[PDB]
Structure formats: C-alpha cells, structure tokens
Amino acid sequence: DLERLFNPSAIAVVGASKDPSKIGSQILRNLLSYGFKGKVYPINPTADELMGLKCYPKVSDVPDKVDVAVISVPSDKVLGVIDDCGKAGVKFAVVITSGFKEVGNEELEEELVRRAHSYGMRVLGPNIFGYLYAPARLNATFGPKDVLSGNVAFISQSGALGIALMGYTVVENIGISSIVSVGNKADLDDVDLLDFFDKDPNTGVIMIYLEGIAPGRGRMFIDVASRVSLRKPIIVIKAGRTEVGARAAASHTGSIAGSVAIYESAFKQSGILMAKSVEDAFDWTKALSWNPIPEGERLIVLTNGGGAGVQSTDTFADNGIYLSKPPESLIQEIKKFVPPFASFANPIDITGMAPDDWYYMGTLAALKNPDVDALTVLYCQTAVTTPIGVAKGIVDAIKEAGNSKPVTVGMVGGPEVAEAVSFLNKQRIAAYPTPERASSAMSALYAYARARSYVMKSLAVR
Amino acid sequence: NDLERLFNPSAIAVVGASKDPSKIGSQILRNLLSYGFKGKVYPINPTADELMGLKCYPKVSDVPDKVDVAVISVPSDKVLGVIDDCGKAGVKFAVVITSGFKEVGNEELEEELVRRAHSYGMRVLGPNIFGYLYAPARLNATFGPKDVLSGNVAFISQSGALGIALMGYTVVENIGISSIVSVGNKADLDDVDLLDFFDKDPNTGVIMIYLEGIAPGRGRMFIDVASRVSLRKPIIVIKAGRTEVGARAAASHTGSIAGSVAIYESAFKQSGILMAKSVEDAFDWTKALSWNPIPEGERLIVLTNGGGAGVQSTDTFADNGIYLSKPPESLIQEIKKFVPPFASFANPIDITGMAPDDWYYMGTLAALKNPDVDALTVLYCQTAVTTPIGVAKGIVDAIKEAGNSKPVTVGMVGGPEVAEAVSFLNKQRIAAYPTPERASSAMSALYAYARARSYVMKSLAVR
Amino acid sequence: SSRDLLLKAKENGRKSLLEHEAKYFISSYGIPVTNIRLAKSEEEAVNFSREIGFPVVLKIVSPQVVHKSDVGGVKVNLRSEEEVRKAYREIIENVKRNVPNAEIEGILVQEFAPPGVELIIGLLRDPQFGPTVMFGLGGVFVELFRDVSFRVAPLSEQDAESMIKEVKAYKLLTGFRGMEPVDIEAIKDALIRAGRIGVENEEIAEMDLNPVIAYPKGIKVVDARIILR
Amino acid sequence: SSRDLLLKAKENGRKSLLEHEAKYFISSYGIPVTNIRLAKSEEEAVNFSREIGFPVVLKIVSPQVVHKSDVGGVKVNLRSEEEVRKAYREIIENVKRNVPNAEIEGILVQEFAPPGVELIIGLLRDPQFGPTVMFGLGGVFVELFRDVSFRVAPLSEQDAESMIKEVKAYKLLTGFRGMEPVDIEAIKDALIRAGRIGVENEEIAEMDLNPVIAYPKGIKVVDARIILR
Numbered sequence A: 001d002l003e004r005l006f007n008p009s010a011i012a013v014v015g016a017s018k019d020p021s022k023i024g025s026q027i028l029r030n031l032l033s034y035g036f037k038g039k040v041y042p043i044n045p046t047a048d049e050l051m052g053l054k055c056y057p058k059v060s061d062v063p064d065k066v067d068v069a070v071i072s073v074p075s076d077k078v079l080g081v082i083d084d085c086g087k088a089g090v091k092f093a094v095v096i097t098s099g100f101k102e103v104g105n106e107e108l109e110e111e112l113v114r115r116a117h118s119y120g121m122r123v124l125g126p127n128i129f130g131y132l133y134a135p136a137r138l139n140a141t142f143g144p145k146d147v148l149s150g151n152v153a154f155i156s157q158s159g160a161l162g163i164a165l166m167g168y169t170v171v172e173n174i175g176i177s178s179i180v181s182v183g184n185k186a187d188l189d190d191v192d193l194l195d196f197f198d199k200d201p202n203t204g205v206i207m208i209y210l211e212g213i214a215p216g217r218g219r220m221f222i223d224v225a226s227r228v229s230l231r232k233p234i235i236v237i238k239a240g241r242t243e244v245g246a247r248a249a250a251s252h253t254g255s256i257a258g259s260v261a262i263y264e265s266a267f268k269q270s271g272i273l274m275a276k277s278v279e280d281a282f283d284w285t286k287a288l289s290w291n292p293i294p295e296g297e298r299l300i301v302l303t304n305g306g307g308a309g310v311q312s313t314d315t316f317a318d319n320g321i322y323l324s325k326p327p328e329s330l331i332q333e334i335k336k337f338v339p340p341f342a343s344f345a346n347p348i349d350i351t352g353m354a355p356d357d358w359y360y361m362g363t364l365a366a367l368k369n370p371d372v373d374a375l376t377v378l379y380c381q382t383a384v385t386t387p388i389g390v391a392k393g394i395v396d397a398i399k400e401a402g403n404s405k406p407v408t409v410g411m412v413g414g415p416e417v418a419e420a421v422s423f424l425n426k427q428r429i430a431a432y433p434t435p436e437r438a439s440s441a442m443s444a445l446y447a448y449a450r451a452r453s454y455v456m457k458s459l460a461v462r
Numbered sequence B: 001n002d003l004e005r006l007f008n009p010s011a012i013a014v015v016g017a018s019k020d021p022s023k024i025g026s027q028i029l030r031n032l033l034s035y036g037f038k039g040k041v042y043p044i045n046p047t048a049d050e051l052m053g054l055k056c057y058p059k060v061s062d063v064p065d066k067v068d069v070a071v072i073s074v075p076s077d078k079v080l081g082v083i084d085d086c087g088k089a090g091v092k093f094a095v096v097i098t099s100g101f102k103e104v105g106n107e108e109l110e111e112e113l114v115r116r117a118h119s120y121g122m123r124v125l126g127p128n129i130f131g132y133l134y135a136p137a138r139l140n141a142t143f144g145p146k147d148v149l150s151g152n153v154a155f156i157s158q159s160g161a162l163g164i165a166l167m168g169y170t171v172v173e174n175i176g177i178s179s180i181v182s183v184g185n186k187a188d189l190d191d192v193d194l195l196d197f198f199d200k201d202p203n204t205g206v207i208m209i210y211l212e213g214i215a216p217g218r219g220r221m222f223i224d225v226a227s228r229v230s231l232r233k234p235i236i237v238i239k240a241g242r243t244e245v246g247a248r249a250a251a252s253h254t255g256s257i258a259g260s261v262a263i264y265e266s267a268f269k270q271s272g273i274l275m276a277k278s279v280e281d282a283f284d285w286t287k288a289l290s291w292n293p294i295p296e297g298e299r300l301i302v303l304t305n306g307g308g309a310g311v312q313s314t315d316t317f318a319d320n321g322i323y324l325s326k327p328p329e330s331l332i333q334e335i336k337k338f339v340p341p342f343a344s345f346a347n348p349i350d351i352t353g354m355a356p357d358d359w360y361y362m363g364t365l366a367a368l369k370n371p372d373v374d375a376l377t378v379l380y381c382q383t384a385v386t387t388p389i390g391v392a393k394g395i396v397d398a399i400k401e402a403g404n405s406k407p408v409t410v411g412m413v414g415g416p417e418v419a420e421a422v423s424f425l426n427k428q429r430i431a432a433y434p435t436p437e438r439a440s441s442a443m444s445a446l447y448a449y450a451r452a453r454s455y456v457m458k459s460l461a462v463r
Numbered sequence C, D: 001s002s003r004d005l006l007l008k009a010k011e012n013g014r015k016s017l018l019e020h021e022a023k024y025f026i027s028s029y030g031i032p033v034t035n036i037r038l039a040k041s042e043e044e045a046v047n048f049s050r051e052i053g054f055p056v057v058l059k060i061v062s063p064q065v066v067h068k069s070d071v072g073g074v075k076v077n078l079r080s081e082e083e084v085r086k087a088y089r090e091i092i093e094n095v096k097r098n099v100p101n102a103e104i105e106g107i108l109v110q111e112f113a114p115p116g117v118e119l120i121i122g123l124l125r126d127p128q129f130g131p132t133v134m135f136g137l138g139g140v141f142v143e144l145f146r147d148v149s150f151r152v153a154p155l156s157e158q159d160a161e162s163m164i165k166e167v168k169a170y171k172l173l174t175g176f177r178g179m180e181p182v183d184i185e186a187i188k189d190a191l192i193r194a195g196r197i198g199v200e201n202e203e204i205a206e207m208d209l210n211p212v213i214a215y216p217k218g219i220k221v222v223d224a225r226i227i228l229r
C-alpha cells in the first residue's frame, strides 16, 4: 500500500545543503514552493537550518515518524543512509541517486533493496528525478516547480525524457495528478503504482513511459493493468519498439531487452494503448482525460472544408474507423441553414462559406441528436470567420448540449487559429492544429472503448 | 504553354472588385496592393471610376495596356462573358476564382469555359480557386492571408478551404514560401504545368502539393515531369483519398473520381515523390528539406543528453528504414574529452543528463566538422542544469563555426522555455521540433529524398 | 508481324486472343512460354507431342469454352504417344456433351511445365497512368491476400527489380525449405517486356500471364489471356 | 497420472519426451493427436497398420534421433503392407548407418493424416511473462515469413479467438480456392489447452505442436515436441 508514499505526514530530504545547486536543495525548494502541508526535515550533517526549517544530521534524530526519505547522497553513501532511515522506521526510500545497475553496479542495487526490506521499507528507484502528487501538494522532484492540475498520472522509466516531459505537460495543457520517476525499478515498479492509481479517485488517466519490466513481473502486470483498464485508460509509450531501439534502451537502462512481440500482446490483453510517439501519447491522453468513451459507432465529422474532411476520413480509416451516413434528422436540421451544395455523406461539409454561428448550430444539432455518439469538428480559417468565434461557438454548443459525448477539434490556420486552439484546450476541449491529429485523438477514444471491451470479454465467467 | 508571365505579369486585371470590401474581388485587390505588386493593377468594375486609388475600367478590353493576367471573381453565369472580353483584350491567363462548375456537377459549363479560353489562346487556372501568390514578384492574387514568410517552398493545393488555411499555417510553422497556387478544379492548367515552371524557377527549391487526383491521360506526363524535377528539387505530396473511403470523400469534394490508390503510390515512387499521410508530416519534412542539403552518406549521428529521447529517435529512424552505426573514433575521442566515462557512444551518443549548455556547442561542433559524419540530429531534454535558449544558441554557433553545410534537425523536450527556443531555431532556418520523433522523422525525410532521387537516377540509366 | 494476330481477331469480332495466339504474341516479345503446337487431328497431336517432348498437356481450343476444366477440356501430364491419344478422344468427346455446338479450332498440345515458384505478371490500363504492370506470387498470395505491386510502363530495370522486392511474398523467390532461389533477372526481364507490350499495343485492353513458373534458371509462362479493346 | 511421463523422463535424465510420450501427454489434456502404436517388431508394424487402417506412416522412436526425417527416419503415405515392410527395414538401416549407436525404442505406426490446413501451436516461457502461447499457419508462413501471434497464458476464449484473427495468413482458415473453411472453435480450444499445459506443468520448458492439421470439423496434432527443464 502506497498511501503514505503519495500522502506522507513527514518527508526528510537527505542531501540538501546551503548550496542551492545541489539536487537535494532543488528538491527541498520545490517541496516548499509547491506547498507541501506536512512536515519537511532537511537532513544535513552540518547545517543547523535550511530554508527556514530546522535541519538534522540523521533521519533517526528527527523527533517524528518520517514516512518518506528522499535520498540524494553519493552512491557510496546511500546504504548508510538506508540503514539509518531503517533504524528510524522509514516506510519509503526515494533514492534519487544514480550509479547503480544502469552503470553495471548490480550488486550495490540488490544490497540496497535487501537492506531496505529488512526494515520493512520500500524503495523507489534508484536513479530517479523524484515524484510529484498534486492532491497532496507534493513536488518531490528537481524538475519543474509546478504542473497544471488534473487527473493524469505519468510514470516514467526514463529520467531525462521523463523530467522534460513533466515540463511539456504544461505546454500541452495536460492536467496532472501525479509524476513518478521509477528509474531502475529495483523494488517498487509499474505494477505497484498501477495498484495505487487504480484506487486513486484523483487519477482518471495513466500514461507510462516504459522500457522494460523485471523478469517474473509480467503476469501480475497483465492482471493489474487489465483490472485498471476496466475503469481508467492506460497509455504506454513503449521504448524499444524495434530491435535496435530495444538495444539502445538496454544500454540506457542496464537491463536486457525482452521480446517486443510478447510486450505488444501483453499490452493488448491488458487493454493498454501503445503509443509510438510522445505526440500521440500526449494527444491521446488529452482526449481521454477530457471525454467519456463513445457509446456507439455513429461518429460525425463536421467540417467547413472538404480537404480537411478527407484528411480526417483517411486518418480515421488508418485506425480502422469508418464513417456512415449521419442520422436523417441531423441532415434535415443542418439543411435549414447550409447551402444546397453542402455535402451530407459524413464528413458533413457545410462549405467554406460557413460563418461562425453555423459551427455553433451544427455542433449543437449533432451533439443533441440521439443517434450521434461522437463529434470531430474541423475548421479551416477563412475571412468569413474568426477562429476564436468558431471556438466559442463550439464551447457554447457543448455547454448547451448539456450531455457528454466525445468531441475533438481540428483547426488549421495562422496565429489566430493557434490562439483559438490554445483557448479550447484551456477549456479542456481537445483541440489540435491539424485535422489528422484531432481524428487521431478521437480514434484513441474509440480504441480505448475496444480495449475495455477486449478486457471485459477476456474476464468473462465460463 | 509558358507560365512566366502568369507568375511575373506586367499587368493584372481584377474583375469583381468593388466599393464593397467584403466582395472576393475586393479582398484580392487589397491583397495585391498591400503585398506590394509593382506592375500595373487594373480594377474592373462596371460603374466605379476608381477603386482603392486606382483607375477602374468597365471592361478589360478598355484598359490601355497589355493585360497578362485576369483575376475573375464574378458569378459563374457571368464568367464566359468576361472570358470573351479578356479574349478580345488578348489576355494570356484567366484566373477563375469563381466556383460553381464541375465540383457542383456543372461539367459542361467548365469544359465550355476552357474551350472559350482556348479559342483565344488563353489559359485557365481553376476554376473554383482562392487565387495564387508569387513572392519573387511581390504578387498576392489571393483572398487569403495578406502575407507569408519569404522562402523557397512552392505550395500547390487542389483544395480551396484546406489550401487557404494551410497558407496561413505556413507562417505559424515558419515555412518560407516562394509561391502559393490554388489549382482547384484544374480544368486546364494543372500540377504538371506548374511543376514545369517550378523546375525552372531558381527562387523555388521545394514543391509541396496537396493532391486529390489528376486527369485521365495525364499520369504518364506527371511521372515524366515530376521525376525530372525530383533530380534537383524534392516534391512532397499530401495525398488526399489514400484510402477507399477517403477516395470517396475526395470525389465528393472535387466532383470526379481521383483514381487507384495503389497505382498513385507507385507513380509517386517512380517520380521520386515523398508521400505525406498528414499535414504535420508534410510540413515537418518541407522545413527540413528547405533548410538542409541532402546527406552525402549514411553516417548519421544522433546526439542526446537523454537516453529516452535517443531510444524514441532510434525507434523512429528504424520505422523509416534508417539504422545507426558506431560513430567515428575521432569523434568519440573528441567527445570523451569532456563527457563522463558512463556516457554511451553507440549512436545515439548519450552525453548524459548532466550535460550543461556548452557541451551542446562542443558536441555539435565536433560532429559537424568530422569528415566521417554526414548528418546530425540533436536531441535535448530540459533539465535545470541547462537553459533551452543556451542549448539552441550553442547549436547555432556550432553550425556557423563548422563552416560547412550538413543536414541537421533538432528535437527539444520541455516547458514554455523549450517552445521559445524551438521557435527561435526555426526562425534561424534550423529545423527544430518539440519532440525527438518529429525531429528524426524530419531527418528521415532528408534521407528519403536522397533515396527517392537515387531511385529516379537509376530508373533513367542508359540502356 | 505478330500484330496480324490482333488484327485478325478484331476482324472476326473477337474480344480476346485464344490461348495459342496469346502465347505466340507473348513469345514474339521475348517472354518465354510453354512450347506449343495446335493439333487439328489426334494424329497431329501425337506428332507434335513427339516434337515438343513428353509429357504433354492437351487443351481444347474454342471461343465457346473459356473454362476448359469444367467441360472436360484439359488433360495433364500425358507421358506417352497414346496416353495423349486416348486423352484426345476424351477431350473431343467430352466437349460434345457439355457444350455440343462449340467451334473447335483444334486441340492445343502443350509442354508440361514442371513445378516451381508460381508467379503472376499482369498488365492493365489505368485511366490516369495508362498501361500499368502488376506483379505478385501465384496461388493464394495474389488471389486471396492481394499481395501485389504495380509499376507504370515503360518499366526501367530499377522499376522491375524494386517491384519484385516490394511484395510481401518476395522471400519465396530467394530460397526456402525444399526450394532453391529462382531467376530474378528473368522475372525482371518479363516484367519489362510485359510493360513494352502494353505501351506499344494500344488495342490490348489487359493481359494476364497466370500462372508463370520461375525456376533456378529461366521462367516459363504456362497460361496467358489477352483482352482487346 | 500423466505427470508420471514427465517424471519418468526426468528420472532417466532426458531433456525431452519421445513422440508417443508427448502425444499421450497432449491428448490427456484434450488436444487431439494421431492414433498411434509403438511397434517393437516388423510384425507389429504390419499388424498395427492393419489395426489403424491404410494409408499409414512409420517413424523411428529413439532418444538419439531428434530429426527423424533428416536421418532417413520417416516413411509417409504407406498404402499397403508391402510398402510398410519396405519402409520398416528402410528405416532401421537408414537409422543404423546415419545414427549407429542409437537405442531404438521402436517404430511408431501412424495414421497418414489427410491433407488440410497446417497450423503451428507453440508454448514458450518468456522471462517477463512466463508461459506464452504462439499461433501461426504452417509451412512458409511461420518458417519463412515469421507470421505469428502470441498470448500470455492462461488464455481466455477472447485471447484465443483474437490471436487467431490476428495473423496475416488468417484467411487460409476461412475458406479459399480448393479448401473449405476449417474448425476455428477446435483451434481456439487447442490454444487454451496448450496454455494450461504451460501454466500447470512447470517442468515443461517449451512445447511445439507442428504440424497441426485443421479440418472442417476438428484438428489433429501430427507431430509434437516437449522439452523438459
């Protein structure tokens, strides 16, 4: 159980000093600025006090039960700190420090875990940049000081790319409930964390950067990931999707590349969506974070540009999603205002003449129709419209529809479109600057529906 | 025949301009003036003595001047009349903005338009288009954005709405443009004609085409011209309707079946064209191809401060049939001068997340100067030991100082500071992206063009 | 001239060439075909069989019969002078009952092609791109899986080679259990020449060399249909 | 107990089961196998052949011989007692020179399974995921093209079905030229049971059902390897 890891009463920081460039010092600083409300105990042998907080030379000296110890001492000092933390009854050792199995010092790593376990203490890492948990106002990383608040839990086996992506979440307007750097995964790993995030009402989506899992861990990974997938979508950025990439990953991690093919199959059985890229991972995470899954296959594409419509159709087709005629009721409704040469084959082409308010009317009509399950709205900037006007129309239609059907938006144009897109995403409406990306995102919603259904079937009582 | 005076006219007439600033003709006239066309402009209006400070005439034939190009935005039922007047005036090119022809099932009107234009020795662009732009002539004959960034990319679009939207999107994506051409219905002038002009155009280095389909009996000509163009300038096609259902949607939009998916793909291969499946891939590739030479060899280096980015890069390169090999020992030894011993040198070269800004300058410089290095993709993951802008500026300095030109793409991961740094690079005409996969994809496009061009050369071998 | 076959067929209002005609026309372009002779008597059949070399294959030749197998029209692997003679009478008599009013041009005496790696070489006319060559592996690989490559004619050596390498079933040509690698150069040559046929002969609507058997040395077209416009 | 087979082999320091042992063990899990008899004399070879019914197959059963065909060890499609006797002595002598010191346990007499759609059903142990079932089409489809699907055991019915549909050569199971559709339920059932074998029997390092012939109703395992750890 990881409740006290993510919601500790007391955190000790081992490796903080008067020098603000030290990793431990960065972490203490983040911990204070992000607004941790529990007790923080800087641990330094000589400092009497750090950042206005009373410093202690050992965790065992703290007159309090320290739930979590963040350790950023040199590798040859780590085990010593582990024994002291162990003496103090620390439950969790967050071992920041690198220089273990990833550089070939496997024996040190195993010793670390053994010693920690003989105290009933679990280890996160080593070789990690920390972890963050927004519901507890807890930023125990030396990464960015802040993240946008939300329901996404991001776990990364990669330190550098992980801590960078932590920053990238802000840019891509992804609300985060948690960041976890698991690094070498010597003890606590993806399965343990999925168990916590399963039970976590603050977390609605889980995104994992994953290079590999430990031998003998796979079946439990499938069991837990599948159960999670019944309620919360899991996206995995699989590193080492190729033999050469797997080889690069083995170099980075210090651990052998497992079978690509079996990993993919395990992902399928777990109901997990495998992303081939960061962009796809983030695009899908956005959509999945802000939309329900579709209740049926009646997807409507609404576009003022046929070309955008075709790009969308091709992209949906590449993901095995095919459009059929819209409901007749919807066609007649939209015919009230569109020109006679508007196309109603799906995509519904309301022509490039469409002013802003047609987008409100069309989006509303679609979303209200009981035979429409999902809507992808495409927009091509022309002078008869304003991007922000179209965006506000979409927002108004969504509000007014007062239901929740999946919606993604694709807007192509200049700087005014970039701002409209930013605006939408800030309202938590999945918007992208190309028709293909919006459709890719909508496809993620449907893919999750199918993954969920796969797992449901696979768990059926026989 | 020759499109020299289409793209570089001495005189343009605008038919459909008026005191109403919302009319299409008016929008086009405004763009022509604000963008700064320095030849003669002749507004054509029945009643106005003057539009936008320029003497207006009631017919093109009344203009006391040789009108090269007539931009026509009058209703469809008035077009043929205007064509006759233009024919009388000796107009060589009729840019028929006006929609309401074959795309709406009016095949006979369209064919008649072309027939009429041809009986005067007049060529037609369109109909059903948003115009065309030619930066070298300071010519903006569209009702699209009034301005584009200047450069060497020619963008041709069969789609009006997506085309005019993408026109704006080039600015956001920092793509330097030499020309925009809306070809719409392609009743007369089409991709092959324009490819012939852009072949010869020293201002144009790259051609990007949004393409739904080409006319029956035009394909062989398309391959012969495109392949030749590909020997010197890369061509990217955003193929619309690359799926069957997509082909149907495209047929609805254009009013004519586009054709065989499989055979189009093969024709693109024979032509040495790079087929993009998406707007983003097309733009990412166009950027790299516009700003870099093609690599002279396969010794591609990935330089990264993050293993995760390296793996993403390696995987992505592999999916595009590009595989990395061990870098030169000279370069390894050079890098070993400053990186820690637990740095990885297998390619990607991992200089570790501990790397400060100047390591990016030093590593990039060493790589680029090395005679056994052909290409470089630089990956950066933001950490507190670095600054994004510092890393970017280190890269810029390295490129300059190497004093050669090897292809380079950059991938930077991080918050708003990374977005600004990436923006900064692209504005230096250095292909930069907010992900490692996109950076590698861009680099993969350079290599893809190299292989495509070699394909064409081989296919053209004597005997 | 080989074009006499196309002209004759058109003059007699035929929309396709007969089997032996198609193969003559194919052969004249340098595409290797089964050694064939048209028999007009059971006696000519034995003679031609002795010329061609046993075993032989006997097929009925008629516009009225386009599925030889369903009407008793094809007898395969005939090893001796009179295996063919009884077979001749079996065909000739079989045809009367299943379609009694059919024209007999004759019975085609054919080379029995040994087994190998079966191929399909197609030629069609695309509205955009004109004559287009199609390649694929025989059997279920084209018919079921549609594993096929296209190149617009004329074909360069580069096109021919690359389109062969393109198909998913390409490894079937480069050796596998119980089968040596086959003559890829020979295949490329047939592809190029097939492209030439389409480009030059405007009256040919499409052409299907199916099956085509590739050996470690050389290839042989076993059947060929040619459709006219 | 069937586990006695594993234990016996273990006690005799063997790292694999013989064909008949493997088939007994597989069959006891409900996976259909070829009717088999171990002949200890040529008279039993003839006798058992008349028991099961011609045509038959004769194989060597010996720990020292693990590629039976490759040593002259397999005689297939024996139509009559005379073919079988020729085959029996042909095996013994073939095996004698090429593998001269082999203990011969006997000769396995088998029903010559009719032609059908060949399958491969595998079981391996992946370091991460433990017992993993592998499925694919036989011949060049797995052997050359590497077209296979995997599921981590135990398999649900959903896993079995989807992994079958997953392989590129799936259409070979749903009917094509010269072949009716085959029993998909039988295949799914076999996959699930192979998964159970792996999960339950820790001492089985891997298992290879190859070939497995699928028919319009039911399937039959023709050869089976079981490796012990």
Ligand SMILES: Nc1ncnc2c1ncn2[C@@H]1O[C@H](COP(=O)(O)OP(=O)(O)O)[C@@H](O)[C@H]1O
Pocket: D034, D057, D059, D066, D067, D068, D069, D070, D074, D076, D110, D111, D112, D113, D114, D210, D211, D222, D223
């Ligand atoms: N009982 C049988 N019925 C039908 N065909 C069989 C039978 N046993 C084997 N075969 C066929 O003949 C081959 C004989 O080889 P096999 O028994 O699989 O082992 P090995 O690989 O040692 O030769 C098989 O691969 C299969 O193609």
Ligand SMILES: [Mg+2]
Pocket: A304, A305, A306, A349, A351, A352, B161
């Ligand atoms: Mg339209």
Ligand SMILES: [Mg+2]
Pocket: A159, A160, B305, B306, B307, B352, B353
């Ligand atoms: Mg690292």
